[PDB]
mmCIF file of C-alpha atoms in Angstrom:
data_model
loop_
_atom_site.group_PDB
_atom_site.id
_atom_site.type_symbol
_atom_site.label_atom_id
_atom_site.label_comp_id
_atom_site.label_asym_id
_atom_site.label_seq_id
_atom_site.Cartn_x
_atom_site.Cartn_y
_atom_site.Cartn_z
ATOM 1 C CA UNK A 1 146.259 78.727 115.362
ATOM 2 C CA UNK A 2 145.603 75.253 113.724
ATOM 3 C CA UNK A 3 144.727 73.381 116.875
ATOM 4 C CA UNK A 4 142.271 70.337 116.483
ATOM 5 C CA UNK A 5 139.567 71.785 118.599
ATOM 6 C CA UNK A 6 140.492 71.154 121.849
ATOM 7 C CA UNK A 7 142.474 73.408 124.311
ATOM 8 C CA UNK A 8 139.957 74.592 127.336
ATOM 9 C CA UNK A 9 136.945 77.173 125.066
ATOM 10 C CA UNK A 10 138.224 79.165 121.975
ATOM 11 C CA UNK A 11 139.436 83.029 123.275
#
């Protein structure tokens, strides 16, 4: 997914 880097870890 091309998220900026910032949701809660990376899994």
């Amino acid at each position: 997914f091309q998220w900026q880097r910032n949701i809660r870890k990376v899994r």
